[PDB]
Amino acid sequence: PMRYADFPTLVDALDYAALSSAGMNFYDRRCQLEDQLEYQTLKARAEAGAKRLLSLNLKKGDRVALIAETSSEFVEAFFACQYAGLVAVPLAIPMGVGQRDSWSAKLQGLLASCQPAAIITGDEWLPLVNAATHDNPELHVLSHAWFKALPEADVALQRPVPNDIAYLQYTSGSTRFPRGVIITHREVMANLRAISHDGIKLRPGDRCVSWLPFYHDMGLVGFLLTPVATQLSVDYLRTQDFAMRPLQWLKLISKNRGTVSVAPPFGYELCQRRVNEKDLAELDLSCWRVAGIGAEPISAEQLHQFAECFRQVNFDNKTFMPCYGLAENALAVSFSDEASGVVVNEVDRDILEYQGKAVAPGAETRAVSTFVNCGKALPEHGIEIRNEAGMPVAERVVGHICISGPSLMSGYFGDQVSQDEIAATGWLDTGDLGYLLDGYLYVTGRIKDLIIIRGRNIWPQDIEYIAEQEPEIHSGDAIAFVTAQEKIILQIQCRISDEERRGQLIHALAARIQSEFGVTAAIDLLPPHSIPRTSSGKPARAEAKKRYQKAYAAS
Numbered sequence: 001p002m003r004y005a006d007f008p009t010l011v012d013a014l015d016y017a018a019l020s021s022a023g024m025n026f027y028d029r030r031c032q033l034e035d036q037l038e039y040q041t042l043k044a045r046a047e048a049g050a051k052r053l054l055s056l057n058l059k060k061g062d063r064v065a066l067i068a069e070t071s072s073e074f075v076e077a078f079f080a081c082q083y084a085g086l087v088a089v090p091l092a093i094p095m096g097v098g099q100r101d102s103w104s105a106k107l108q109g110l111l112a113s114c115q116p117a118a119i120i121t122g123d124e125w126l127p128l129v130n131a132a133t134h135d136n137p138e139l140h141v142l143s144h145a146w147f148k149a150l151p152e153a154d155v156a157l158q159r160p161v162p163n164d165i166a167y168l169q170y171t172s173g174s175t176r177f178p179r180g181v182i183i184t185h186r187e188v189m190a191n192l193r194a195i196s197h198d199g200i201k202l203r204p205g206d207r208c209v210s211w212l213p214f215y216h217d218m219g220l221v222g223f224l225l226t227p228v229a230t231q232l233s234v235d236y237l238r239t240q241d242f243a244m245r246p247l248q249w250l251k252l253i254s255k256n257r258g259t260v261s262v263a264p265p266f267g268y269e270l271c272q273r274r275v276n277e278k279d280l281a282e283l284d285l286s287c288w289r290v291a292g293i294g295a296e297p298i299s300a301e302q303l304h305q306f307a308e309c310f311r312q313v314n315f316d317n318k319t320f321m322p323c324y325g326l327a328e329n330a331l332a333v334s335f336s337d338e339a340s341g342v343v344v345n346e347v348d349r350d351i352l353e354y355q356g357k358a359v360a361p362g363a364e365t366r367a368v369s370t371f372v373n374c375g376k377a378l379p380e381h382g383i384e385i386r387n388e389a390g391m392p393v394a395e396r397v398v399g400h401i402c403i404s405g406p407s408l409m410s411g412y413f414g415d416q417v418s419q420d421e422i423a424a425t426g427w428l429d430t431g432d433l434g435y436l437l438d439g440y441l442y443v444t445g446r447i448k449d450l451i452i453i454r455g456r457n458i459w460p461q462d463i464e465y466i467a468e469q470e471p472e473i474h475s476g477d478a479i480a481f482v483t484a485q486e487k488i489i490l491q492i493q494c495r496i497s498d499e500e501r502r503g504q505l506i507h508a509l510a511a512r513i514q515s516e517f518g519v520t521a522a523i524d525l526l527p528p529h530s531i532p533r534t535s536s537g538k539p540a541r542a543e544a545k546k547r548y549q550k551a552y553a554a555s
């Protein structure tokens with residue numbers, strides 16, 4: 001009997017789901033069931049774990065760092081935290097090895113920011129953990145085995161209340177400035193309620209499919225918590241397994257008649273880029289009811305490519321649902337209409353760059369940007385476009401996207417200023433640029449990423465697009481930003497070995513951009529993969545901008 005995130009507390013939520021027959025299903029890279037976890041069972045393992053955790057003399061409010069793998073182990077640990085009233089803090093594994101020194105610097109800052117009293121990890125990362133917590137004595141380091149091996153602290157489990165902290169979301173900080181989003185039970189529930197009942201609009205019989213990491217915002221709140229608060233089943237792939245065989249995602253959907261799934265723009269592009277007939281041989285995608293896109297500025301153009309690619313296996317493009325969100329609001333902020341397909345608004349590009357206004361292309365329009373409709377505000381939540389000064393602007397005026405309502409965070413963990421402002425105004429400036437049209441939000445990009453030169457602004461992605469036209473360059477391979485000396489740099493990480501082609505493409509690209517944009521850009525060909533992402537899994541444009549700046553000061 002379905003309930004739409006109805007509950008006060010995540011523990012309440014799960015208590016109800018342990019009464020269903022649904023659960024999670026972990027699949028290997030060949031879509032083979034590798035491990036299963038029923039909610040009924042999850043509740044038990046969570047209660048027991050909650051008591052084990054307490055035997056460690058950990059007090060309510062205390063933080064427990066989890067190494068967020070896509071695993072039955074991690075899920076249990078996470079709810080074990082909720083039930084034990086401890087604050088869960090999901091951390092990302094190492095981006096590999098060789099980046100494993102990058103990781104430790106990151107990890108130590110995470111620890112300085114929230115002082116976890118314990119950290120549960122899988123064996124694989126156990127060495128690394130110990131080698132990195134080298135100088136945090138006050139930290140218990142538990143393998144999942146040692147953790148499962150603990151004694152039930154003989155105590156009566158206290159039920160959590162709405163205003164308790166449920167978990168901290170760290171994707172929001174840099175390696176230099178770690179920021180922790182505080183999410184209370186009330187807040188994560190408000191959003192879960194919004195998503196299930198108002199945004200996505202789930203139905204009985206729906207079934208989710210995710211390949212997203214639990215360490216990112218989307219994967220976790222959208223795909224661990226939402227199937228739990230909705231008593232709906234879900235199937236996971238590992239994020240790395242998808243990266244290597246994209247089509248295994250569509251496979252999984254078609255295999256179990258999957259219904260709902262959401263990925264970033266590139267998740268969709270990766271697929272259509274690397275599909276082959278052998279792959280289309282299994283696929284039937286009529287069951288796919290809602291295909292969501294968000295996390296980064298959506299490319300209408302791509303999504304069209306993808307839909308065109310999979311019409312033949314029954315992908316309905318009307319199932320597309322562009323949506324918008326951030327961690328600072330738990331997850332979701334807006335969703336495109338039900339059964340909408342991608343809806344776009346075209347604008348005179350020059351009017352946007354020069355006058356910061358979204359107007360419709362006229363007879364004299366010479367350039368056009370396309371923005372994707374990301375929906376209207378959710379029930380009880382507000383979305384407002386404000387300018388520099390903090391004053392609300394009209395429709396079609398681009399400015400700072402500001403949000404408010406129950407989902408809003410409490411502030412950054414430890415940050416008094418952040419909590420004070422939110423407590424005072426009830427509004428948060430997301431640091432994203434956009435505008436409204438007939439109440440729908442159009443997200444154009446991050447204020448941080450915007451290329452600001454004399455008297456006009458350019459959207460870095462409009463320039464990077466020109467680079468992605470080349471066969472060798474893909475989306476994300478190219479980063480654009482403006483140096484502090486007002487010189488525009490375009491960095492491109494690529495596998496082009498031929499020295500003749502390098503020179504050829506650099507010269508062609510320079511020209512093509514000075515034609516299109518009236519700006520001369522410095523093409524920087526880098527090695528792959530030489531530019532990596534931020535903690536939220538997007539292109540670190542701003543980070544690359546300073547790396548370059550700091551570098552250039554060595555002159």
Ligand SMILES: CCCCCCCCCCCC(=O)OP(=O)(O)OC[C@H]1O[C@@H](n2cnc3c(N)ncnc32)[C@H](O)[C@@H]1O
Pocket residue numbers: 171195200208216217218222223226260262292293294295296297298323324325326327328331332333374430431432443444445446536
């Ligand atoms: C079953 C239910 C599933 C529910 C699906 C949930 C839908 C939520 C969508 C993703 C949540 C998220 O990505 O978190 P994060 O803090 O890491 O990134 C935060 C930042 O991302 C950028 N940004 C996200 N969207 C964008 C978009 N459309 N256009 C342009 N910029 C977008 C922003 O500048 C933003 O402030």
